[PDB]
């Protein structure tokens, strides 16, 4: 069963003494009016421990005499054995050998220190395992919890399980700002949650409890980006690689063709994915960054050589053919691709058009049989050489969505906002769009030629309209500059959304200035 922990979980954040001060500490706490799960032991399954738990109980017999923390409870994760024998709050942080069900009725650390409420707030900050308490015989009251004991265990705990030999609660503490109220004697007489209701963060900003009738800029409103829009022009300007690999005739071994590739986009991902290409060896480049980065001065060398000469064209290779045919540079950057072509470039009668140079001064026919080896079969070789502009891969291309705060990225520029259909016309060479402030104000997407603006996300202030706390507790919430469709009775005005209050067609001399015309009252 679930119940309402109204104002429970308000302890002393420090042993510092303070007198009659409204001190605001951003300490992890059980939120006001949170959801606290009442348990009944009639079993006791494992219970959560996020940032400590606001424990509580109402027993006239002291039936709870056991805590078991930790994760494994097999003498591996550091568990605890807190027990209360009605004479002293003895705390055992050592390891006991628990079986399937720990027995009711080698240790590391041992320590000793119906008409009753037994609250047992925990904490774990800086390895300082605090154990609070308060016994005030869940009502609509308020009782601060003093730091009964503290334990410098310095271990990580995230799960616990209350154990006994029938009403044991649990809590959830979250990093909530929290405004305290000390009396003269230095104890906590009242408290205020911070993110509970608009009046709560009003009290947070004012750092008081008796708020006056007025409007307070407690925070600012912001619309976060929803998704990402990355767009690049059409891939229709593909590189003419289809006619290069499918050419009927290829050049000779001594007349290898070199071609420049530019002003086009090529999908190398499929090129290195499928391997109808027998050899694919890359040096000086990372295939991981091939799709994410592009190179400059890309050159393609295409020729046909026999199979066994593929590995000879490589750095650190010595031989007659390698030295007298083609020398690769020490800092060669690119990929070497070679594939079989015996199905299309071979004839039974044999081709005598291939000739080789026998003698050379200084550095810069074939027997076709069914049983001949692969190395004697002709192989087409294409080598792509890269140097570390105008030619790059498609990278990423996402669709366009408008009328919603997104993260648009046109051609490689950042910026988040909401895109609007426009009418103003550009010049064909012009892409950007700016006002006097030199900030982007319009754009043409790289794929089509339609002109769409860029207007910032619907941000602004968010103020709380309240009467005095002595007058009322329900409040209005202004939203500054933002229309009232982004964010009770909604109401739109030039000031913005005013969730909470009611439009009135009448008009009186107003008391709480809203903005841009409206006033609120009670």
């Amino acid at each position, epitope marked *: 069963a679930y119940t309402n922990s109204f104002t429970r979980g308000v302890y002393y954040p420090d042993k510092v003494f303070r007198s009659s001060v409204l001190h605001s500490t951003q300490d992890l706490f059980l939120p006001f009016f949170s959801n606290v799960t009442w348990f009944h032991a009639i079993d006791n399954p494992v219970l959560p421990f996020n940032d400590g738990v606001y424990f509580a109980s109402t027993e006239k017999s002291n039936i709870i005499r056991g805590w078991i923390f930790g994760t494994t409870l097999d003498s591996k994760t550091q568990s605890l054995l807190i027990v209360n024998n009605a004479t002293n709050v003895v705390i055992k942080v050592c390891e006991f050998q628990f079986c399937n069900d720990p027995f009711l009725d080698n240790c590391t650390f041992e320590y000793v220190s119906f008409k009753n409420l037994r609250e047992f707030v925990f904490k774990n900050i800086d390895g300082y395992f605090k154990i609070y308490s308060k016994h005030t015989p869940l009502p609509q009251g308020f009782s601060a919890l003093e730091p009964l004991v503290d334990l410098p265990i310095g271990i990580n705990i995230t799960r616990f399980q209350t154990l006994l030999a029938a009403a044991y609660y649990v809590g959830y503490l979250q990093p909530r700002t929290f405004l305290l109220k000390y009396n003269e004697n230095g104890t906590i007489t009242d408290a205020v949650d911070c993110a509970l209701d608009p009046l709560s963060e009003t009290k947070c900003t004012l750092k008081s409890f008796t708020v006056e009738k007025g409007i307070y800029q407690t925070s600012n409103f912001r619309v976060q980006p929803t998704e990402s829009i990355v767009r690049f022009p059409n891939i229709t300007n593909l590189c003419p690689f289809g006619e290069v690999f499918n050419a009927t005739r290829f050049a000779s071994v001594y007349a290898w063709n070199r071609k420049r590739i530019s002003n086009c986009v090529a999908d190398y991902s499929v090129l290195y994915n499928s*391997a109808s290409f027998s050899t694919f060896k890359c040096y000086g480049v990372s295939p991981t960054k091939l799709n994410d980065l592009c190179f400059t001065n890309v050159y393609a060398d295409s020729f046909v050589i026999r199979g066994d000469e593929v590995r*000879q064209i490589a750095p650190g290779q010595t*031989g007659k053919i390698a030295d007298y045919n083609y020398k690769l540079p020490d800092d060669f950057t690119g990929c070497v691709i070679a594939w079989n072509s015996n199905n299309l470039d071979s004839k039974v009668g044999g081709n005598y058009n291939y000739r080789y140079r026998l003698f050379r001064k200084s550095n810069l026919s074939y027997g076709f049989q069914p049983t001949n080896g692969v190395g004697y079969q002709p192989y087409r070789v294409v080598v792509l050489s890269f140097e570390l502009a105008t030619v790059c891969g498609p990278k990423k291309s996402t669709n366009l969505v408008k009328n919603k705060c997104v993260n648009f990225n046109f051609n490689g520029l950042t910026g988040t906002g909401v895109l609007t259909e426009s009418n103003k016309k550009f010049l064909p060479f012009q892409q950007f769009g700016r006002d006097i402030a030199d900030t982007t104000d319009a754009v043409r997407d790289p794929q089509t030629l339609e002109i769409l603006d860029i207007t910032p996300c619907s941000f602004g202030g968010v103020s709380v309209i309240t009467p005095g706390t002595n007058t009322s507790n329900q409040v209005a919430v202004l939203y500054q500059g933002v229309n009232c469709t982004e964010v009770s009775n909604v109401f739109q005005t030039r000031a913005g959304c005013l969730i909470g209050a009611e439009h009135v067609n009448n008009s009186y001399e107003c008391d709480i200035p809203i903005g841009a015309g409206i006033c609120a009252s009670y």
Partner: antibody, heavy 118, light 91 residues
Framework: QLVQSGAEVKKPGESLRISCKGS????????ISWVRQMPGKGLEWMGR????????NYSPSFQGHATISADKSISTAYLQWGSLKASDTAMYYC???????????????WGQGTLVTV | IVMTQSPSSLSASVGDRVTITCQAS??????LNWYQQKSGKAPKLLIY???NLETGVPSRFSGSGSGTDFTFTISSLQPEDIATYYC????
């Protein structure tokens, strides 16, 4: 011919080992290349191991998923995986590389059979 | 090296689920094929790597199986899928 193992008759969840044994020559004196192929497109090349000097040329696309190990006690090359998953469906080639006296690399012999399943 | 496919024959209505199996012998790693081949033409081979997914491959085609058998399920017969599916032996 290079001798390997054939298909499956066994239940899932069992650990198993393969081999690539050559005859008529010293297995440790010849380069062995492992090439990965499986249903749908061409090959992938991850690298080769030379047990004489432990020189490994790792392909950049390889991300340290398949550990490379050698057994010098039996002078046999075995391939093992540190962590197996359901998504490990791959087949591995084993072929004889260039001769020790030859400085030119070639692939003259290919495998004889390993049709593969777990 | 012997290959068998099961079931030998089956009867079903249009659009019914079709499941076929392919069997094996010995001790091995993990990778095996399926091909789409006509009566006397070259086989066809759609998805690749069984652990990588090819872009442009329709998601309606999938493969499974562990230990011995491989299960290929045809959710809906298509006019362009009228052929015999072969698990093919090579090395």
């Amino acid at each position: 011919q290079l001798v390997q193992s054939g298909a499956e008759v066994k239940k899932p969840g069992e650990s198993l080992r393969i081999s690539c044994k050559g005859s008529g020559y010293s297995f440790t004196n010849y380069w062995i290349s492992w090439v990965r192929q499986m249903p749908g497109k061409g090959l992938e090349w991850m690298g080769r191991i030379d047990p004489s000097d432990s020189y490994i040329n790792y392909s950049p696309s390889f991300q340290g998923h398949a550990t490379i190990s050698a057994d010098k006690s039996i002078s046999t090359a075995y391939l093992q995986w540190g962590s197996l998953k359901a998504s490990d469906t791959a087949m591995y080639y084993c072929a004889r590389g260039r001769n020790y006296l030859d400085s030119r690399g070639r692939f003259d012999y290919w495998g004889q059979g390993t049709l593969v399943t777990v | 090296i012997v290959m068998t496919q099961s079931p030998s024959s089956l009867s079903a209505s249009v659009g019914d689920r079709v499941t076929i199996t392919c069997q094996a012998s010995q001790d091995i790693s993990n990778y095996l094929n399926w091909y789409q081949q006509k009566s006397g033409k070259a086989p066809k081979l759609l998805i690749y790597d069984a652990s990588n997914l090819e872009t442009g491959v329709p998601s309606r085609f999938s493969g499974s199986g562990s230990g011995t058998d491989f299960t290929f399920t045809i959710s809906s017969l298509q006019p362009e899928d009228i052929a015999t599916y072969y698990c093919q032996q090579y090395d």
